[PDB]
């Protein structure tokens, strides 16, 4: 049974979150959670929280039994940018985009 | 055990039972054309037209659906000369089956 959890409007680029996400993909939910705890990227926490929520979602809303779960699917798409300006030298004003992601985790037992 | 014959404006090596696509051919869909000037026949031991066409070799086939090939595009485009035209062309063909090869 699939069962999934996601974080939309995550305040990280995507490129960065993906970096963490690829560590985890297709791992035993257990081994996933470990790889995350000991990864020093702020995305790690962002994605650990999803995995967790997702596992919880599994156990509570469906078959559960977190013993078999795998992160069978994880992919993060890019959310909207918040748009800003950077006062710069000689009156020039620069753009700058604060970027966000939508993290999606899908956990199951098959 | 095959033979060769001029029929498109082109020639074709052919054996009985075998279908070939020729250029168009008035002959109505089901009838039987008879190619009566074959330029070679062969088994294990064979007959070249010492002249053109082997003495009495003929070939028989039944037309078997007429048709138009898959469209193709003609593009002409002359760079910097404000010029180009595109064109579509198809091409009638008739298909014959080959029952003959009367040695």
């Amino acid at each position: 049974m699939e069962t999934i959890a996601k974080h939309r409007h995550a305040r990280s680029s995507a490129q960065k979150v993906r970096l963490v996400a690829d560590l985890i993909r297709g791992k035993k939910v257990s081994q996933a959670l470990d790889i995350l705890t000991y990864t020093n990227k702020k995305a790690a926490v962002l994605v650990k929280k999803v995995l967790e929520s997702a596992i919880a979602n599994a156990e509570h809303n469906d078959g559960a039994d977190i013993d078999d779960l795998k992160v069978t699917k994880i992919f993060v798409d890019e959310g909207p940018s918040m748009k800003r300006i950077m006062p710069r030298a000689k009156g020039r004003a620069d753009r700058i985009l604060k970027r966000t992601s939508h993290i999606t985790v899908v956990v199951s037992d098959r | 055990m095959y033979a060769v014959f001029q029929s498109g404006g082109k020639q074709h090596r052919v054996s009985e039972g075998q279908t070939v696509r020729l250029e168009k051919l008035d002959i109505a869909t089901g009838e039987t054309v008879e190619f009566a000037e074959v330029l070679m026949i062969a088994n294990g031991e064979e007959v070249k037209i010492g002249v053109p066409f082997v003495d009495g070799g003929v070939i028989k086939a039944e037309v078997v659906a007429h048709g138009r090939g898959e469209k193709v595009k003609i593009v002409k485009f002359r760079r910097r000369k404000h010029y180009r035209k595109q064109q579509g062309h198809r091409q009638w063909f008739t298909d014959v089956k080959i029952t003959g090869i009367s040695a």
Binding site: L19, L23, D34, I35, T37, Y38, T39, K41 | -
Partner: protein, 56 residues
């Protein structure tokens, strides 16, 4: 100095051919407390090689 043509979405890819993080693998469990922990590191509840060190 600035680029003369936009780089393909492919070159980005290739440039990043090395960006992948490496997962840890190298953590273990304390013989005396639950406690996973990086090799050669204090466990959170404060253990190291059994023997509870660092009382905090």
């Amino acid at each position: 100095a600035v680029q003369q043509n936009k780089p393909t979405r492919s070159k980005r890819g290739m440039r990043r051919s090395h960006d992948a993080l490496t997962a840890v693998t190298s953590l273990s469990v304390d013989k005396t407390s639950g406690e996973k922990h990086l090799r050669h590191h204090i466990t959170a509840d404060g253990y190291y090689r059994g023997r509870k060190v660092i009382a905090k």
